[model samples]
Target: KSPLTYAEALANTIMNTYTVEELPPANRWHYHQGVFLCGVLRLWEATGEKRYFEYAKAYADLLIDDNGNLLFRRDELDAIQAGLILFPLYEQTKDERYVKAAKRLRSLYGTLNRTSEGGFWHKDGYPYQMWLDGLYMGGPFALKYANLKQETELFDQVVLQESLMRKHTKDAKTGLFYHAWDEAKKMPWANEETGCSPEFWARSIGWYVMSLADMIEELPKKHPNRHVWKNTLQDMIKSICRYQDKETGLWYQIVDKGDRSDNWLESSGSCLYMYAIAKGINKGYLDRAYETTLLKAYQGLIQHKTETSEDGAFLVKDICVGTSAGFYDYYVSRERSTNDLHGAGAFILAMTELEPLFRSAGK
Candidate 1:
């Protein structure tokens, strides 16, 4: 019998299914790959597998040259994501080029487009808007780089991003943050006075909490503003758990609205929620009862969100395709994909985070 756990089997299936270059979009430097590779790299750390290391390194080799120069769009936070791969790569290999590439990414902070409150606009096209998704996209990488370079300001800036996103997007009634804040009072979904988008899309909230998990992990102990990060996560997850589909132990595409017949449970966001909760409890940001929440969700993922191909490869299912912050219909109507990188990526991240807890209690 194969000794691999569910998480290992999932990683191997993905590695076998695609070469580093063959990851969808065929050949490109993109977050789709970055998010997946982030999982692979985490797998490497978990299993000490040379194959996973080479696979992640293979992608890095394609993009980062000896001069550390690479082509990427500078205007949005998406490009900053795959840069997460660079940290371990640089650390393990002691290659300065990775650092050079990271510095270039960090440099984007200078000319970054922002709102008057100093939150990053999700991207150039989404002008004057700060989306919940942007925090995970950019915050972890920024915090990691900050620790790498001992830059205190990056911590404050990231904390500010967390607060600003909450200030603008949080719904006091539901304890859920809206998907985006359009400072210009624009977009079909934006509220005229508040500028917040209409719905709380699952993956975007997943991104927000996931980044907080990492930001709290990476922040130095003596940092002056650590409480903000913890409290934000504490409140966010408390509310997030409130809406979990009690029967499925999963969440919906439109997170808080599972009561609607049209809304379906989604795996990607569910996985991220599990990851953040696991990380939260491990890091002391969450209390013990949430352990049951993590366990239930992890089992639910294995039972409901995964499948084996006829040829026997592992597949993650019901992964909502790439989405922007939008209305209720817009979110529920989005495509449901099988084994999409974001879903599988989030699945693997969640599995890894929850695995240690499994061993502790034999759950």
Candidate 2:
């Protein structure tokens, strides 16, 4: 009865909770489903379980057309994330539609609004802004497609997006980034001088660091900017380690303001941090020293953030709802929903990603 890890149990519960189309905001392409399904697909790759693959494929079939056209927002970076699913589906089925859909999704890089330096705007609605979340949403899929199709230009393009975010959103003092950077400085929250958003929201930084860890692994060892990412990711992880709640190992919603009573410990972002750190350790982008960080987080998450229903369904709690870049008060007061896709997916990612290291170098 105690056979499956928490990740396996939660993933099974999520599949049981929602059928392919029953995933939230169903009947459309979105990252919420993209993330959770991607985690399941990853577990499929690791565990060789046919059910996990079928679960993800079922979701893909809902939005993908026979010809690869799908109803998704091409103008926003958010939509590009679901394209991550297409790669595995393509590989497994030897199908042309998945590649075609991905090609169309890739076209967004050419058509979507961008800042002067070629960083993608988070969305058309928020013109001239690049949220940290977009880095994770778009970076890995772009790089993966690049490797698949020999799009060498994409390698540099991804580096540039990350570089621009680092330049504008970074806080030198904390070595942590704020939620976003707006080139036009139009939003009320934008800093007039730097145009960066005010606070370092936890999941936003998670998205940024997670992508950095992933893109580094994707980059060819000889890729010129590889060192840049390694250095940046190491620095970012070190900064995050500083603000982790000492007793609990979880991070607060507003990352830097842990001392503030209003800022609460969040689960989804903590899960993302664990995945990034775990990946970083496995990929050698980070030294083995950080495994302790991953270990603490793994322990902390299960101890504090998980719940079991009377029916024995696993549920993750304290996931912040989808949020826009905002000020301290807004971030601290955001809604915390149970078993939200973001939290569930991140926990799955963290657990699956970390278990290997636990076997090799666990405390």
Candidate 3:
């Protein structure tokens, strides 16, 4: 299929699934919603479709900046990813509202309290809890906004956050990242010494590894840390591949071990890997050989998982829902709901990136 055709299908699928103005919690909302729009913005960029752009803008306008007062919490850091779409508009139009909204979002980062090493607290309430997921949700936009507005120190701080997260949360055994770490060790699941939770959540690592690639792709030429960014990103790709479930061509929701009954293959993590693999090859971060793995994943999705919904929507089967750092039972016990927002979002990103990536090379 042509790249634009895939983009159109994915876009229609997401729009059909989550049509409500506000996503009901436990199913969708928060960062999941924001990230889906992020993919839409990317599709707009790739397909040059005015409708995709308008859909993104409508979502952004309704929930955020609909009123002059934008009220979001520091923990809702994922919301800031929306700035990717909004900031570019501000840059092009020089419109004060767009600029103000992006600026307001940045100010929340200030409240994302820091570790001694200077990573933002994942949230004000979760003191000194910097999860691997936060790195992608907030980091890229934080750096982009900082660099755009000439906030040199803030951009440097963004790099520090990722470095600190990897240092604290990376696994000694596999080099993959654990989902979250509590400095205070107050949470029950947190390890007494390292403060990290027990299992490796698949979607968490996907966000971290993919963020590294995205940051390296978008980093400014003048930034001194560019090489470190590139090296760190490549290291991430190496680490993730080690844990991939080769037989299924997908990642387990509990990523570290896929053999357990509770450990199931998840859609979001699979999409994240596909995005990293496809986008990395396009950006020259990964070797061309990796593209084969991406095709393997795409075929795997079709062969083993996808189903058609009553509404004629494409239902992505077996997607693990939003997770927490609890026991194995907790991670596995979460129902494998179909067509969750993050699952849809990740697939759209993969579909959008891979469409052109495959065509241009005549693959």
Candidate 4:
């Protein structure tokens, strides 16, 4: 099957599952709504169907406005970043509201929060915090919107954030990146001098891995730093592989050596890794030597996480619930949920990336 087909199937699942509950009010519901809406947009782009477009536009309309302003607070960076999904809505309809909404989201840069080195803090609530999760949650969409607005200088700033993040947070020995950096070193998990969190949280690294691939896809091919992004993407995959579980073909909740009884495989991180590695191989950033890992992980996912409902539609289970920074016990303590957006969204992304590989393998 083509990647587009799987993308469609995933979108259809979202539409069906969300009918009775279009927006679940928990576990970062706004982010889930936005991410699922983006999947709908992808389906619309893939199929040129008006229904999907209308559905996406209606959802987008709830949040965006002209004058480049978002409806949410500055600290709600994830909500603000959802404006990127409105780009295609504007293109299809020539609606300035969509345009304004997108630009307004891009305007958040340096306005609400920033790292000491100038990266946007994930949010005001997360003061002096830069999580690996934020790179994809806010950074790529922000950069994509900036590029769309012809804010040329802003892309340079975007590039610097990833470079510095990779330098400061990545563990050379483990080939894994840490979760969040409390720049003020005040968070309970942060190292006093370095402000780096202790262990590599698996989902956070998955977020970073996905961030690199998505940004590289959006970056202008001719830009000087473009190659750097491509290289960083490859390096990220190399790092991820070292920590992948050999038996389960998934990743631990804490990526680096979290082999204790409390730590087990986590679904969101596994989905993110699967998506990142699958796309990396499909796009030629990764060598074929790692295809076995992807294949096994896919099998592991289907065996452990995939299920079918009474209507014969697919459902995903075992996704970890929302998490906060703390000691090792804190991460492992969070309960898992079925069909959580982070894992479900990442699963669809992984399957989308995987579809092309199956087709090309025959050739």
Candidate 5:
């Protein structure tokens, strides 16, 4: 009989179920781990619990050396995401180790490959291409560092990235963005003329929406382009709401393809949408009118949670695997698995924001 609410219970379940040391052996600073920490760190912030904070710090400490050298290369945006945990860690510990690590990540923006128009390449291997995922990976860290250092010019780059993403990728008819864009139009997945990918992949939009909401939260009120970011966030939310499944309050794998029999509602995308929507309302970027919408979606996600094993393993089913932008079959063919960090991280993120609203509603 722990007094933790459903949200805290879920957070504890995940921390207990998955340990940082158990993260799959790969590059330690990958985005999947960062995404998970994003939620865990938020839980730490929400509850003011040292255990949660220490858990997040442990993830960062594993990669950072005593002299503040990071083990991973900075050429990719994904690597920069995990480094963001250092900022808060620095705040808590006053350790120069975290600051030096963060400074190293910030330096990557200057050297990393970018589109001719200035959007970051998703990775060094992904030359001249901009993926929506890159924004979530890179923008928040940049914005947070800019605000921290009072580097006004650095803030402009954040706005510039958003503007470029919108100009190059947005579909005027549906207001949905193509998942990735090839500025050189060289990739096989890229469209020849527009350089956009073929369809609106759900997680791609989810990444963009989350990035937008986060930028709005971090951008200062007096910053000149603050309104631009807010307006962009509001516009995306309006478009996203239209595609949310009416019956379940979740979104489909292919966001615009609800009529297609193979496209099913996805958990990670749904959780990310819930996180962005709830965070949008919480931050005043969206109106209270959308609160009911978020609540329904939250309940929808809670119902989707699954439990298994006599040992009490908890999982959220149907999180689509990591995907590259592709055609109809490509998205529909991707694997949907249980207990992946993407869904669990996103679930914790949504609840971390939504718990306050739940309490207020007397739930």
Candidate 6:
């Protein structure tokens, strides 16, 4: 146990205030709640408290029916994000229900529409398109499931998806990726010739970064393409670090638009980047030379973004609401709410990854 108790306090706020019972069935299946539950599950692992696990399990339970069919929209990739919790739940209890549900989700990957280069469409509704957000929504879950089941080919698929995203969406000069891409270059948001969205939206890149960090942990050590992911992750971190705010140690909502008067520091994306960086360091995917960078971002979040509400709930502020790829003003106009589950989840996720490091440093 350590003197710093912020992780526990934040976990308590989530479990107490956003109890599984309080959230709507639809919300329980959303990417926002999925992201939050990932943090909650990590808090459970980090703290060794059964309550955190119970909270996560309760949320998962809501998604499954009596026959073990998951109650989520199969067409939307975002819904698959929360289903990841079922893997560990199945591991702990050996419940066929959980694993079966997970396998059912795995089956969807086969049928999911893809672009010409074979990147999974963001969803059924968004054909011939791939978004950075989809990488986190589905890629990590696929890699972990493959590892669990000894599916070597799935590793190749994950690598291919990531490689294609980088090949198509990355801007050479900035080393940043556009939010979405259209294979046909037909979507109104896509650049006429390049087929990329207008700008680098921070949260989309956050999702992509977080996916790389998480997948690096589960990729088999002996797998031939494991280094492919590590190299990609390292390159991405280097690029993002170039844009880190010198004064605040946070990133702008539109990552490259920091100089614009309308742009502001956003908490969820910052937390995701900090979590990925810290986790990367701990896993040896990145060098300890970046430890200072991790600490600066983490401390910046704690000092400027998080607060305790009147009733003692932890509030992570400046979380931009959910968005689709759009123009510059479209992103800047999104509401930034306090204690939005998105930011709260990312915050705890970072803390869970960072807490052990904090403990080790003190020793």
For model 1, residues 1-363, the per-residue Cα lDDT tens digits are 111277788888988988877987577777888998899899889889888888989988888887999778888898899899999998899999899989998999888889998989888999999988888888899889998999988988888888899888889998898999899987888898898888999999999999888787688886655687788889999999999978989999998888899999999999999989988888888896898888778777778878888999988889999998788998999999988887777877877787777777644
Winner on lDDT (3 vs 4): 3
Measured by C-alpha RMSD in angstroms, how accurate is candidate 6?
1.9
- Which stretches of candidate 2 lie above 4 Å from their native place? 1-4
Indicate the worst ten consecutive residues by lDDT in candidate 2: 1-10
Estimate the TM-score of every prediction: 0.97, 0.97, 0.91, 0.90, 0.94, 0.95
Overall local distance difference test of candidate 4: 0.72
Off by over 4 Å in 4: 1-10, 19-21, 26-29, 47-50, 65-70, 311-313
lDDT of each: 0.86, 0.87, 0.74, 0.72, 0.80, 0.81
- 122-190 per-residue lDDT for model 6 (tens digits): 888888888999888888888888878888778888889988988989999988899999997878898
Worst 10 residues of 1 by lDDT: 1-10
Q: Per-residue lDDT tens digits of candidate 5, residues 86-119?
A: 7788888999988898888888899988888888
What is the alpha-carbon lDDT for the whole of candidate 3?
A: 0.74
- Model 4 worst lDDT window (10 residues): 20-29
Q: Stretches of candidate 5 above 4 Å error?
A: 1-6, 25-27
Candidate with the larger TM-score of 1 and 3: 1
Error of 1 at 75 (Å): 0.7
User: Between 2 and 5, whose TM-score is larger?
Assistant: 2
lDDT of 3 by residue, 1-363 (tens): 554565577677877655436543423226776777778778877878787777766665665553434555446666676566676555545657767778878887776567777777776667778778888878888778866788777767777888788888887678777888888889888899999888888888888867877887566686666787667767777777776778878778887788887578887888888888887888887888877777878777766767666776767778778766676778878888777777777878888878866686644
lDDT of 6: 0.81
Give per-residue lDDT, candidate 5, residue 293.
82
Considering every candidate listed, which one attains the maximal lDDT?
Answer: 2
Rank the models by TM-score, top first: 2, 1, 6, 5, 3, 4
Error of 3 at 294 (Å): 1.3
For each of the candidates, the C-alpha root-mean-square deviation to the true structure, in angstroms, is: 1.7, 1.5, 2.5, 2.7, 2.2, 1.9
Q: Which of the numbered candidates is closest to the native, going by highest TM-score?
A: 2
Candidate 2 residues 213-272, lDDT tens each? 888867877887789888998999999999988888899999888888888999999989
